[model samples]
Target: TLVEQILAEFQLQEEDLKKVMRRMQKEMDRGLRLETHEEASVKMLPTYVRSTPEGSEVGDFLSLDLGGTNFRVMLVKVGEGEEGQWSVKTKHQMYSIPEDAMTGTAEMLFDYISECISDFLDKHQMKHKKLPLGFTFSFPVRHEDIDKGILLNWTKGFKASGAEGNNVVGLLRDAIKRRGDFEMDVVAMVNDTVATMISCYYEDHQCEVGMIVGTGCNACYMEEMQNVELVEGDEGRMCVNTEWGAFGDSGELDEFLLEYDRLVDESSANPGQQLYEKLIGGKYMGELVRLVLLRLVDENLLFHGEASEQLRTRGAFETRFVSQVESDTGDRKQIYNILSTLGLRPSTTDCDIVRRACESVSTRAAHMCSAGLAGVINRMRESRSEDVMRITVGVDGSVYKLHPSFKERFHASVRRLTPSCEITFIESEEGSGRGAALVSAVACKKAC
Candidate 1:
């Protein structure tokens, strides 16, 4: 019924549905490989401005992380009592966006954020002193400088009007100023990728790549001045932060992309920019899989004339569902039910289709992740003249960490691509909140 409504609304056909699926799959595959090259070669991107001097005294600071789905606020007290010691206590509160606010004014969103911050400060009793606050705004932003970023288009299903293209730091600062009671200084402005990188760099010296693969996909790599062709700066000094998601349009694509990727492009915001992300990111993965199953049904490829009403609904299929079905190996009856969840009535031969779909999705995600890792390794190999390169990639988000098969598949792909490089995908221990605290410390030039 949902599909019928959508079809009637959009005037779509079975062939159009098939075309969309095919394009989605192809783009997902291409995005993974292209991410690697983008990471390796992007030069304008800045390196994580990590906090300095381990065990140094960094005074009390406040941090805020505005990630895609959540807003986290925390108070970090460094070198409180013990000599050469640091500790952090965080008060995290969550607020979900109201459906009406998604396309509302920027002022409304900022008002909401400011209210959350005020509540956080009030609840924690943390507003006695004028402390520096680090803000981690997780969106695609054009950084005018380290402390200033202009908002580009919002992702993660957020399209709050008037926020796009405005200076985010200025907006937040203005919002905080309007409060008239709190005296806080906005010290640093960072993206989630940048914050993750800074977090890892504070812990490990070898961290060079910061990657985020949830809701959307993006990477930031450290670049030398000489390698940066887009910007004019010091030749031998300075590290550039390269936004690597906008790569891979160099005209090499497999069968999947040419067929399925175009549909995804047409459906997305800022269609041409994040072509690869349209395929592999969290938002699109479920849709991609759904489209594929629908095509198979329309062509009588898999489930023929069963109850597929649920499967035809938009966003009915999730990547986790595919993973669950793949990992399940019990009685055939249970498997039949599992298949039915996706609107498929399992036949004797249908198990293979289920297995193949799982394999296809997982393999594509893993291989693409590995390729991006390999690209970072190759870039490091060219930049640093070390015989043996030991690089650390700071990986954040639950999708990468919680997925059982993802790590194994990623490591296996890395081994196959670059055997010489010693690569470690470090789970981000210093989360965005903590990383924002560190950024505040660094911006103030305080030892932590």
Candidate 2:
């Protein structure tokens, strides 16, 4: 009963949820509208991949993925899969960029990446004077050409000076020039979501939508070449990168947002940016649960009015930990273990409160993610022909692929929001690195 009283501070009524659904529909409309016109927090940017893969394109290309938490160098070969699809043979290495590189000068970060690429080449014993490469830059970038990536602004704790306003491709080129060893022909620069779309199209002829929900979240899907009015003369059916993470800023979303959500947004590295991402992305969900539990402890709803040092620290809770708590099914042992690890002696009430809070946060995240996907799906449905009865989407993320309950919760949300639509979701594997390789084959200007 005491725990229920505390949870009342975070409860949502049916009317409140109805308002959230209607308001989310409005926001999706605004996002789609902005895709063609301009930026209103959601810049539905264009990915220059204007054509789909014909399922027979073959090539061996290199991919460099620089994401929020990690960077990878991948040599992917696009060929026939053993299972009757376009199979990929990939050799890659994932590197964790230090916090110093993330917040320091741009050169420091790019130079380290350049070194890693060079090392990969040496280890493979593959020498190319001008190798075809695709750079999968997983941040928000604006570029007219396929090869030039210009940072709109930093996200996910990246604050590299001398990188935001300048051309990121040129900066990476400069960093490569400093290496003074091998030559790399940067053929394409892509968003991971776009790469997922392109990669899915390579394997399945029916994949119309692609999404990434790992460390961060974004979506891309195919649009009719005739219907796209994004550019004046450059009219073609292209994949649009919906940087949908910036939703909820247009003020309508403030109605259902929890106080914890507002706290996470205001205290993030980029305040008032990517508000939607802070809600569902793997980076922030666990932290949100921690904040609520900490609040519960402070209000004497848990831990007999006391807390431990680990419980008091930031980032003591993790997404994996949240997953552990959510997936626990017997004797509430994992929940007890989590509290004990944090040095908290919990009674049954304390464990129950924490477990329920984790479930509520995780459920909200899954539904919100499905809501974003529903917006994309509904937009595509406007152009759906009667003959085209089925739509397919490719979802790529550790959260979706590895989390036990995320996909189940997400599928239910999709069914609830987009009724009467026959849709299939395919798990797109290695989409970030291999997707870039597939894109380089499709978008490259010069032959490899």
Candidate 3:
């Protein structure tokens, strides 16, 4: 009955479903080839020009990191008590912006943010004159140079009009100046991906890829000089940022994209964009699984004759919930407990359908991820060496950390894709906060 229900709901026969699976596999193979063979490149951030201060020369500075859901502030003292050693006095305030603020005036948003900073400094007794601030504005932007970036368009459901085409650093600098007590220098404006890379590479000599899997998905990787056609440079001395999110567009898509994925993309802030992210990002993973389950229910794939009304709610399921279901052993009681946690009533057939759906989604995501990584490895064929190219990948965000099977799946995929090249995913130590502070220190030629 469950199988009949699924077949009827999607209007597909068993053979059609197999065909869809085959198509997905073919598309995945194509994606890998494109990623490997194509020479994709982006501009380089001029971070190395700034010198690292010797011993005790660098002084204290402040940093502010504006990420998806939180605003963080920290006071960083470099070389405070020991040479080449740094200490941080940090305070993080977590608050969600009103929904209206997502589409509100840039001035109102920045004013509120500035007010928070002023209050923080006053409470901490941080003298305004001595403090130079590092601001990390995380979003998609077109950088004119390392010091300046124009907002390309806001992702993550943000739509601030005046902010676009304007320098984010200048806006924040002006906001701080209006306060009169603080004179802040806007040094080192960076995307979260870029900051993660810098932070990881600073600690590990082998880090080459930086990935963000949180609210939205995006990845940046190091590119060799020969591969980049946009800029000419001397051999053995250049690395370019490859924005991998834009890759899947040029290739054919699987059945998943045709039936359900197209609608997700159509409704997104940037419609028909970031196709790969739609299936993998924290914002969409749960929804994708939900859609699959909904289809199964409509077809009468469950033990019951009809689907539950509660299951109709959008985003009712999450990847974490799926992970829970997959983790449950043969014990039906454990499975029931998992379903209850997800606000579902489970029967034997219902449990089977749910578990199957989870397996399908997770496996698909992992397989596609492997294809993308394989594409990168193929592109870097020349860099392969016996010394273990030692490519370090910087990964951030809650989904990669919280999702039970995502990390294992990702590593497995990487291993399958590139058996010759040794790759390691390094958890970002300082993340956007520290990288922004470090960049600010480098930009101002002072310690923070």
Candidate 4:
């Protein structure tokens, strides 16, 4: 039976998980050292900040975060207060970019984004003589500083022309000028991971690491400028954005990670890339399950009585479906509902097989994710303070926060290494807009 064959084929035990985490920590170490050079798969870009917010930066600032399928423009307010005594209130409008625009020219896309921003300002009666705007472009970009970068290559389903090789800030700056709706200063450009760290730092100074584990995954952290060899002559600390989802391309993967991930890779617009993200990210897990199930059904291990039209289609299931199946308890009424919803009926034994698939895929993802965090903790410890220093990693993402199995397993993965320092995990929601505003506020302070 194909189901029996694949069930054994894709079965990953705890030993497999332990080995993957060990390799991931090794990759994290390698990435940190490689950041000192010109280039590596992990382009460890620098965010020019000597330190995090003192929790004293306060002002009304604007920021735009474009990632995945949505774009948001925010009017953020960090109330006037002392360090560790501040607050953030954000009023923002989220707009989904037209599918056509995502694949159009740079001017067309940013113009649409600017028009949305212009509309948000007008509808909200936001009249500013000059507002400081920070743009958070969430795809992988080779940024020069906080406010400038070139799109290395578009990830997250964007294939816009004239944007990949050009400065994104200049593109957005031109777009805003084209709108001419209001006078504004484009002060900063940041990734969601960096913004997340900044946002968490505005309220808690201990937050040193920012990570996003949702539709995709990446991380940023504070590093002493002296340690960052790629940049010279800096006395202050800075943020190193680790584009580490490109980790496993150069290394060897175990059979399961590579085999399961390979199936999803060929299914992508760009194959042989983001090889690591597929192992742990939400966007690909359901598809992994689907591929395994198809092989199983072909051999008649399960679902022998059913002919599912949806099952014949790839991506007919989603991460949400897997989450439901994993958490539905023994009876699996929810799992049955999901299979029926997909135009297939399943027997009790068939439901068990599907449930097992969900468990293996999500479990492996959580283990991979946990290893990434563990890697961060390990690299940062080489330069820890005397006695003991506490560090907080601010995390924002659907998979890390809400996914039932992935969330708990990530925490377990981190603590297992017995980190030589105190590392705390903090849930930082709305890091893009809110954190960018805090950074803009910090800049205003420095400039004043």
Q: Estimate each model's TM-score.
A: 0.80, 0.91, 0.79, 0.91
* CA shift of 74, model 1, Å: 2.6
The clash count of every prediction, one per candidate, is: 14, 2, 4, 0
Q: Scored by CA lDDT, what does every candidate get?
A: 0.62, 0.75, 0.60, 0.74
Full-model lDDT, candidate 2: 0.75
RMSD for each of the candidates: 7.8, 2.8, 5.9, 2.8
Model 1 / residue 79 / CA error / Å? 4.0
Model 1 scores a C-alpha lDDT of 0.62
Candidate number with greatest TM-score: 2
Clashing pairs in 2: 81-87, 225-237
Higher-scoring candidate on lDDT, 1 or 4:
4
Model 2: ten consecutive residues of lowest lDDT = 227-236
lDDT of 4: 0.74
Residue 85 lDDT, candidate 2, scale 0-100: 34
Query: By lDDT, highest first, what's the ranking?
Result: 2, 4, 1, 3
Mind giving the per-residue lDDT tens digits that candidate 1 earns over 204-298?
76776778877667766666554444334535533334444544444323333633456656666656555556555767666666666566566
Candidate 2 residues lying further than 4 Å off, grouped into runs, are 5-36, 52-57, 80-87, 127-129, 233-236, 445-448
